[PDB]
Subunit: 63 residues, 6 copies
């Protein structure tokens, strides 16, 4: 691997705006998962079998 | 691999705007998963068998 | 691996704005998980089998 | 009269959500009644001859 | 009259949410009644002949 | 009359949330009643002939 004057952006996240208003949120959960917020993952490598890279709102009931 | 003066953007995410308003959200969950928010994943590599790269609102009841 | 004058941004996150207002949030949880806030993960490497890189709102009831 | 393991909800009011924007008003009243806002009466019993339960913007020039 | 393991909710009011913006008002009243705001009466019993339970913006020039 | 293991809620008011912005007002009243704010009456019993339970913006020129 050789980079020579090579401006690079390997695996990034940027410029992520969010606006809400008057969001009268009622939420009720029982045993489950709820995700309502901004999430920003940025990885270069996730190696290994059985991996779970960057889940969100995940539920796992493996027997 | 040789990059020579090569402006690169391998695996990126950017410029993601979001606006809501008056969103009178009621949510009820039982055992499941709900996802209502902004999600931004950006990976360069996810290696390995059985992998789950960047799930969202996932449910897994493997026996 | 050889970098030579190569401005690099391997695995980053930036410029993530968020605005809320009057968000009369009621939340009720029983045994589960709720995520409503800003999350920003940025990794270069997550190695190893069975890994869980950057979960959010995760639920795991493995038997 | 008896309840067992029950969930009664006699005479309630809830989740009455209201939103008003720039309601630029010029209310002029003379001798009458003007009602312009939220109102949530919630009762169980009114027992009387000639009574008035839950009036709103009422005029009784009897 | 008896309750067992019950959850009664006789005569309640709740979660009455209100929002008003720039409601630039010019209220002018003469001898009458103007009601412009939130109101949440919540009763159980009113027992009287000729009574008035939960009036609002009432005018009784009887 | 008897309760056992119960959860009674006779005559309540709650979670009455209000928001008002820049409500630039010019209220002018003469002899009448102007009501412009939150109000939360919560009673259980009113027993009297000719009574008035929970008036608001009332005018009784009887």
């Amino acid at each position: 691997v050789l980079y020579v004057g090579s401006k690079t952006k390997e695996g990034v996240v940027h410029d992520v705006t969010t606006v809400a208003e008057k969001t009268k949120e009622q939420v009720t959960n029982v045993g489950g998962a709820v995700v309502t917020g901004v999430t920003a993952v940025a990885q270069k490598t996730v190696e290994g079998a059985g991996s779970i890279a960057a889940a969100t709102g995940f539920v796992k009931k493996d027997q």
